[PDB]
Amino acid sequence: ETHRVHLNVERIRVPEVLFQPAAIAGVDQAGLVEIAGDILCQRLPSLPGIQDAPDAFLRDVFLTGGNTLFQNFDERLRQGLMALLPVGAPLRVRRAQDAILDAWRGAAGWACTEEAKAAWITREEYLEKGGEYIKEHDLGNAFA
Amino acid sequence: RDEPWKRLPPPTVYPVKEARFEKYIPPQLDGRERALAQPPGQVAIVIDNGSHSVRAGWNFEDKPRLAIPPIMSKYRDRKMGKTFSFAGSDCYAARSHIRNAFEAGTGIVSNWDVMEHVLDYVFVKLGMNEDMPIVMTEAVANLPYSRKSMSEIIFECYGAPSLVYGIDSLFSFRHNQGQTGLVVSSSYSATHVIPVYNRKALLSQAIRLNWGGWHMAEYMLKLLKLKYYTGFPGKLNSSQTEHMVRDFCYVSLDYDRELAGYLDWTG
Amino acid sequence: KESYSVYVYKVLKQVHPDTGISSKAMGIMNSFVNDIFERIAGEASRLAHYNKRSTITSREIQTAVRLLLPGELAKHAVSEGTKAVTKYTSS
Amino acid sequence: SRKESYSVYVYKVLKQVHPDTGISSKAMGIMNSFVNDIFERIAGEASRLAHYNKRSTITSREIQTAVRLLLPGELAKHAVSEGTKAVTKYTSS
Amino acid sequence: DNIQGITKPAIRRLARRGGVKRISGLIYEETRGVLKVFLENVIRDAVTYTEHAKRKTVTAMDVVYALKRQGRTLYGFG
Amino acid sequence: AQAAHQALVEQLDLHSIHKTFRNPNWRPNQRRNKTIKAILGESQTNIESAPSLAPMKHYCDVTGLPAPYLDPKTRLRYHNKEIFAMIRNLPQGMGEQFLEARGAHTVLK
Amino acid sequence: RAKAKTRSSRAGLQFPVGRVHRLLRKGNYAERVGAGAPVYLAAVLEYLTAEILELAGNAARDNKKTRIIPRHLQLAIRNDEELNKLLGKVTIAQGGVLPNIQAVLLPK
Amino acid sequence: AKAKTRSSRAGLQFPVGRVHRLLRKGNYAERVGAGAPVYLAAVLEYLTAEILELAGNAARDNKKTRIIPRHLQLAIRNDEELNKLLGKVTIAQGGVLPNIQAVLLP
Numbered sequence: 003e004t005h006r007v008h009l010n011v012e013r014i015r016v017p018e019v020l021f022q023p024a025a026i027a028g029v030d031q032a033g034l035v036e037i038a039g040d041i042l043c044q045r046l047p048s049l050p051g052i053q054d055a056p057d058a059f060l061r062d063v064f065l066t067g068g069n070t071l072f073q074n075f076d077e078r079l080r081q082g083l084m085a086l087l088p089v090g091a092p093l094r095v096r097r098a099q100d101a102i103l104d105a106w107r108g109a110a111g112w113a114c115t116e117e118a119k120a121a122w123i124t125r126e127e128y129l130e131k132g133g134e135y136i137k138e139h140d141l142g143n144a145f146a
Numbered sequence: 147r148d149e150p151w152k153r154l155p156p157p158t159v160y161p162v163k164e165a166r167f168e169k170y171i172p173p174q175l176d177g178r179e180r181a182l183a184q185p186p187g188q189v190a191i192v193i194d195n196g197s198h199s200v201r202a203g204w205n206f207e208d209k210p211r212l213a214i215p216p217i218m219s220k221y222r223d224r225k226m227g228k229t230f231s232f233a234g235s236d237c238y239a240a241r242s243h244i245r246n247a248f249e250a251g252t253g254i255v256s257n258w259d260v261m262e263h264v265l266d267y268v269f270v271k272l273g274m275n276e277d278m279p280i281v282m283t284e285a286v287a288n289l290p291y292s293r294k295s296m297s298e299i300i301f302e303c304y305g306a307p308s309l310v311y312g313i314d315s316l317f318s319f320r321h322n323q324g325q326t327g328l329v330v331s332s333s334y335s336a337t338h339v340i341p342v343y344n345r346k347a348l349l350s351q352a353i354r355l356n357w358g359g360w361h362m363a364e365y366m367l368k369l370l371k372l373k374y375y376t377g378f379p380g381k382l383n384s385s386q387t388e389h390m391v392r393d394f395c396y397v398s399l400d401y402d403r404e405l406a407g408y409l410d411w412t413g
Numbered sequence: 414k415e416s417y418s419v420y421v422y423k424v425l426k427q428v429h430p431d432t433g434i435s436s437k438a439m440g441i442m443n444s445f446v447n448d449i450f451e452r453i454a455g456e457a458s459r460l461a462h463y464n465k466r467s468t469i470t471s472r473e474i475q476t477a478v479r480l481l482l483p484g485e486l487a488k489h490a491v492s493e494g495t496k497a498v499t500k501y502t503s504s
Numbered sequence: 505s506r507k508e509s510y511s512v513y514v515y516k517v518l519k520q521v522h523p524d525t526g527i528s529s530k531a532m533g534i535m536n537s538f539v540n541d542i543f544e545r546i547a548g549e550a551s552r553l554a555h556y557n558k559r560s561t562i563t564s565r566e567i568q569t570a571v572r573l574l575l576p577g578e579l580a581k582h583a584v585s586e587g588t589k590a591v592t593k594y595t596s597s
Numbered sequence: 598d599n600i601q602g603i604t605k606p607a608i609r610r611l612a613r614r615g616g617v618k619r620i621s622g623l624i625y626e627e628t629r630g631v632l633k634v635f636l637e638n639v640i641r642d643a644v645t646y647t648e649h650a651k652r653k654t655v656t657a658m659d660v661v662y663a664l665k666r667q668g669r670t671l672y673g674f675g
Numbered sequence: 676a677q678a679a680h681q682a683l684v685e686q687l688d689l690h691s692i693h694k695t696f697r698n699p700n701w702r703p704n705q706r707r708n709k710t711i712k713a714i715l716g717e718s719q720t721n722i723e724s725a726p727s728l729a730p731m732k733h734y735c736d737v738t739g740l741p742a743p744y745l746d747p748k749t750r751l752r753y754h755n756k757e758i759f760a761m762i763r764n765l766p767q768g769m770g771e772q773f774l775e776a777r778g779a780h781t782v783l784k
Numbered sequence: 785r786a787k788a789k790t791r792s793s794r795a796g797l798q799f800p801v802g803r804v805h806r807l808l809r810k811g812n813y814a815e816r817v818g819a820g821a822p823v824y825l826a827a828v829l830e831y832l833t834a835e836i837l838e839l840a841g842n843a844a845r846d847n848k849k850t851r852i853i854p855r856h857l858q859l860a861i862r863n864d865e866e867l868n869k870l871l872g873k874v875t876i877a878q879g880g881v882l883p884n885i886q887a888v889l890l891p892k
Numbered sequence: 893a894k895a896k897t898r899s900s901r902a903g904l905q906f907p908v909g910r911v912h913r914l915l916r917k918g919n920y921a922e923r924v925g926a927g928a929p930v931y932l933a934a935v936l937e938y939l940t941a942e943i944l945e946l947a948g949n950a951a952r953d954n955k956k957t958r959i960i961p962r963h964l965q966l967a968i969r970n971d972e973e974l975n976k977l978l979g980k981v982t983i984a985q986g987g988v989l990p991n992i993q994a995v996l997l998p
């Protein structure tokens with residue numbers, strides 16, 4: 003009886019820090035809903051070179067990572083984006099199929115294609131170009 | 147009044163699921179025999195360098211072969227007179243001199259003496275008795291010194307034909323057959339939001355939140371340390387709080403109404 | 414010929430604004446100040462030498478205050494000191 | 505590890521005053537404690553004397569005065585005598 | 598409870614060592630109270646030194662310092 | 676009895692298997708295993724984290740209930756008078772740990 | 785040079801953090817003294833001063849006087865459990881004693 | 893040249909060098925004068941000798957060659973000047989002086 007831990011509020015207080023970080027745990031950053039709204043509504047319409055900021059990026063917002071398999075996580079993000087976006091946007095939030103294992107399968111399917119063959123770094127390229135050499139692929143980071 | 151706990155049912159209790167070991171040592175050599183049978187250019191070893199679980203396998207399959215934490219541990223026994231060093235899941239979490247390859251709280255590798263032995267365990271348990279290409283994951287906007295040190299360990303220590311770095315969430319995007327969207331990926335170290343426009347990541351404006359599953363575990367440990375205030379007779383590890391979070395936490399839909407009437411007696 | 418008079422006066426006119434204090438009483442209060450100073454400083458020095466440190470940090474002063482002053486006195490003193498050091502750091 | 509003590513010198517003095525007598529480790533601990541304690545007392549009072557009279561040096565004269573304040577009665581006179589002998593031998597050599 | 602481990606016989610012996618011929622039955626509980634107050638004062642200081650030193654173990658030195666702080670210098674330890 | 680555990684310790688080992696592919700010419704450098712502060716000091720990317728500016732709903736930090744008012748002595752958000760009682764008689768050294776769990780402890784230096 | 789802000793103020797204090805620092809440093813308590821130490825010690829000295837002077841003014845009002853004197857300081861230092869424990873072996877000049885007559889000596 | 897210890901130069905068994913170090917490194921003063929450790933070593937040696945002499949006598953009286961804590965207690969409490977110097981001091985395993993108050997005897 004003494005060796006028992008009861009959980010009441012910790013069920014809904016701990017996975018809530020993703021949405022209200024500055025109040026529950028004091029991390030002085032923004033919530034997930036507010037970051038998604040900042041990107042969808044204030045940066046992407048102001049970026050030249052793309053056609054439709056709400057009509058394209060809202061077609062597929064899906065959730066990938068391991069810290070996602072909580073009950074009712076996509077619905078919270080959908081209600082937040084529904085509160086932020088204009089009325090009539092075809093919002094459809096879904097998730098990946100194998101959330102903790104698709105990060106491996108995507109690089110498994112990518113590994114032996116022509117873009118990957120055009121993005122490798124061989125040994126003599128490491129001997130010549132140096133150490134911090136970046137083949138600019140559309141998935142990797144920015145070249146330097 | 148005896149009513150509020152007279153007809154109350156007996157409790158349904160759940161035990162502790164601590165991340166222990168598991169009784170398996172496979173020296174799997176049946177993958178190299180299939181890898182040497184394929185034509186060249188279509189054989190590569192893919193390593194997901196995850197902060198919670200480094201995964202590794204061959205590209206022509208669907209499940210990864212090795213899925214281990216970056217835990218290693220080295221010892222010296224004077225009662226036996228021998229130096230031990232095993233790594234991965236073979237550590238039991240009875241002895242623990244555990245240090246991790248990832249820095250606690252950030253998915254940037256800065257403990258290279260651990261990462262070298264982790265990669266050593268990977269290449270041993272895959273089977274290397276002798277030169278395949280390597281596709282390896284990293285974090286978003288990685289520091290250049292970490293990439294330099296990782297490339298130096300790949301070329302100089304082991305000897306590899308080629309390696310290429312990529313972002314694992316974007317690989318899971320490309321496997322999920324998307325073209326243009328908003329990838330939100332909550333990892334073990336940080337939660338990234340990355341806009342992708344026609345199979346191209348717009349990394350000039352992606353934003354990472356500094357919260358993750360490790361922060362879930364540590365904050366859960368702090369709240370169970372401060373809830374049970376007068377002293378709890380029990381070892382409060384971080385990993386058992388992580389397994390509490392994995393199966394006893396859910397994001398509530400309407401938080402400010404659910405929260406204020408949560409600790410009522412009725413129910 | 415330096416004395417904590419000035420400061421005793423400023424504190425007095427903060428806590429009982431229209432009340433004065435006599436010259437003899439000022440002497441006694443100054444002696445009080447010197448005595449408490451000495452005791453705390455000395456206990457702090459001892460704690461330092463005992464822990465093989467060569468510096469009297471805020472943490473030495475805190476522990477000295479907790480050893481010297483009784484009960485509520487100790488608690489309130491710790492509080493005030495902590496508040497002061499915090500404000501100093503902020504500025 | 506390393507832990508220096510006065511046990512050596514205590515033993516030297518014992519074998520001058522009573523050559524047939526020994527000393528137990530517990531008694532040696534007490535004697536080690538005693539030497540430390542009275543060192544701290546005399547050095548401490550000499551420190552105060554120096555500070556009071558606005559002096560920065562614990563000279564022989566501070567130690568003498570500290571000894572007169574700290575030790576009772578005949579112990580003061582004898583201690584002051586041996587101290588005066590010691591500094592005389594030292595400075596004359 | 599544990600204070601009642603300081604038994605009536607134990608207190609008797611201590612009174613005998615102090616030259617006490619006859620002991621009223623009320624002395625035993627008074628002695629326990631007096632002892633508890635003394636130990637609390639010394640242990641409070643000993644823990645205070647222990648905490649300062651960033652240790653979890655109370656040492657003989659912490660007790661000796663606590664006793665010297667309170668004017669009851671103990672020779673034989675340290 | 677402990678022979679099975681000893682065999683499990685022996686077979687789970689890296690030095691028991693010879694490294695048939697490690698290059699012995701390579702030598703490790705000492706100046707590794709740094710921190711993020713040190714690596715950022717070397718290069719003076721990863722500054723895309725963004726703060727917020729919005730009203731925050733302040734909850735309790737003893738319990739998880741919504742709490743509307745704090746204290747002068749200890750600066751703790753608290754729900755009602757039971758939690759106020761447990762705040763004003765808690766043993767010392769924990770009233771700072773609640774602000775440590777919430778953040779902005781500001782421990783002395 | 786930028787304007788000299790007194791540390792007492794930088795601290796929100798009436799007491800002289802400056803002088804306290806001199807006394808700790810020039811006073812051989814140790815080889816090195818932090819800034820924190822002066823600040824904290826000055827604060828603690830102010831607090832106790834405040835308590836004593838407050839109780840003393842309370843006593844002075846109780847006796848309908850405008851001026852704190854030694855007897856007042858004394859009666860203050862003796863009516864508080866905590867100050868009397870802090871100053872339990874201190875004599876205050878011109879302080880006098882607290883009024884006390886045993887019961888057995890009182891008229892019966 | 894050959895080293896001559898300040899102890900031997902002063903005619904003392906007690907360590908003048910060690911005492912000098914302890915006076916410097918114990919933060920007692922900014923400066924420690926050359927005569928100070930010689931004087932302090934002389935005094936500590938004297939008082940050491942005085943207690944050990946009386947303790948040796950106490951040991952002899954109990955027909956033992958080893959000074960045990962009991963002998964230090966008997967030595968200290970039977971000399972008025974030691975008992976005034978060490979009045980507030982407790983000695984482990986020392987015991988008490990045999991003393992029954994006059995009115996308790998039959």
Ligand SMILES: Nc1ncnc2c1ncn2[C@@H]1O[C@H](COP(=O)(O)OP(=O)(O)OP(=O)(O)O)[C@@H](O)[C@H]1O
Pocket residue numbers: 067068069070071072101102105195196197198199253314333334335336359360388391392393
């Ligand atoms: N069934 C589940 N329910 C909830 N959470 C889970 C479940 N299974 C795993 N998790 C969480 O997923 C996390 C592991 O995520 P994962 O290992 O994919 O991140 P990662 O890819 O290593 O991160 P990074 O890319 O930063 O290295 C763990 O914190 C665990 O809490």
